[PDB]
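BUG-288 | component: ligand-complex export | severity: low

The export step for magnesium ion jobs runs without errors, but we want the raw record kept on the ticket for reference. Input record follows.
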Amino acid sequence: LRRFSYGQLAAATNSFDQGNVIGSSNLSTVYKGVLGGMVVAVKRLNLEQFPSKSDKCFLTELATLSRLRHKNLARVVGYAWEAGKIKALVLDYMVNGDLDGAIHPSRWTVRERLRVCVSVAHGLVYLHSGYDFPVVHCAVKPSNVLLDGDWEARVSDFGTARMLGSSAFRGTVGYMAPEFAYMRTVSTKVDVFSFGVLAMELFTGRRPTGTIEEDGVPLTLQQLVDNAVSRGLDGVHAVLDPRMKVATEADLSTAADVLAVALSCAAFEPADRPDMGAVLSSLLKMSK
Ligand SMILES: Nc1ncnc2c1ncn2[C@@H]1O[C@H](COP(=O)(O)OP(=O)(O)O)[C@@H](O)[C@H]1O
Ligand SMILES: [Mg+2]
């Protein structure tokens, strides 16, 4: 874990040039950087506008990601830490962006989307049981999945991780387990729920914002998928991402099987959700 100064990260990012910005939120701006010639992502927290939340997310991500290692996780190269001036994570640069941009001839066939599901599941199995304590990510969603130069997926953004020991919901809320959204209850099952929602979005092309129907009742993405799956393969076909090639019986059948796993992941009661190892097992069986 290398420590960097402001001047080093300024030089690496061409004085934090607007043209080097590869990601953005209220809390951080992510820049492409080049250090000996190593290409990196510089995630710079918004100290000036949100000092307290910046500090919490910075410390959480640094403490968590510095102790973890797995091929389907983002990798921390180092950090800068100068109170009032800069707090930043230096991460391995993922040249193919994030899954949200990938979703929203196309390479994203059914088999390739299933491969991403398997890669993310490996990352989450590692988080939940590969380290000395369970780590709950708490913000699993496509914009927190990065893509390699080999298009290998990696779980990123540990600013909300916990170590144990029109639309109905907009923004982030649609990915959140009800007990986490309403009560801030944290268990590995909240990642399982978010994984299910992610798979649903990956295969339908739909953000989990849901819709409020004319009688005022919300139709969640889970309920939409549940209705489609219950109507068989033709029901599933009607709900799949229209930009995705679905021509063979095998591709439709695989998509149907992912959505059925995704529905178990996104069950309302945490105790009815599988653990990620069981999820991974189902996805590995479908991969053969
Ligand atoms: N290591 C990286 N390599 C390439 N792009 C990245 C990397 N980390 C983040 N990004 C881009 O920046 C966006 C925001 O990153 P994230 O860590 O989620 O910040 P925030 O916590 O503020 O959302 C990501 O969705 C992705 O597009
Ligand atoms: Mg975040």
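Assignee comment: Attached the raw record above. The longest strand covers residues 28-34.
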